[PDB]
Amino acid sequence: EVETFAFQAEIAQLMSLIINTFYSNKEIFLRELISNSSDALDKIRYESLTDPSKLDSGKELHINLIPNKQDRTLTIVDTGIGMTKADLINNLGTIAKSGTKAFMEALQAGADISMIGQFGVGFYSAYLVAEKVTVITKHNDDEQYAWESSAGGSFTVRTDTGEPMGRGTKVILHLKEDQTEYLEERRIKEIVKKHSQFIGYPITLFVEKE
């Protein structure tokens, strides 16, 4: 059972702008997604301070980066608070409609695309490098779901049959054919050290057999 939804018009326009604008500094996508994971780990931590049973689904708090050259995917995994089905449908827990309107107003007044995170919609910078994004997520108060979109104005939500993750979110980037540099260990390391060196959770870069 798969359900299909239309993006609100402002989010559809934001995604088409990210996909079709000439902008060379694409590497900022990974900074924005690591920051999103850190915010979600802060949230489950705060809830656990008064109710430790919230970590019955997993006590480790971390971020993993997993490249796969055979599938041409780069995946970002966190053990944060996760998303309910309502959260996924509601623009992955963001205020994306008003955030877009601010981002547009800022771009006209001189800002550039790398400031996207200051408006609450940094998740959509994934489309600088991906042609499709799949999101797997599990919140303590709901079941495991998969969200997916290739842009084009719609997304799908379904109940996920894959491996149970316990609690958290997985962002799988199906990369554009000319953006494979972001599967290389040296390149990922460079980007993390430049943009994310003070994140307060351990970041582990997996390697491959090759």
Ligand SMILES: CNc1ncnc2[nH]cnc12
């Ligand atoms: C983008 N929305 C998110 N909500 C909850 N956990 C996450 N981890 C990465 N992105 C998120």
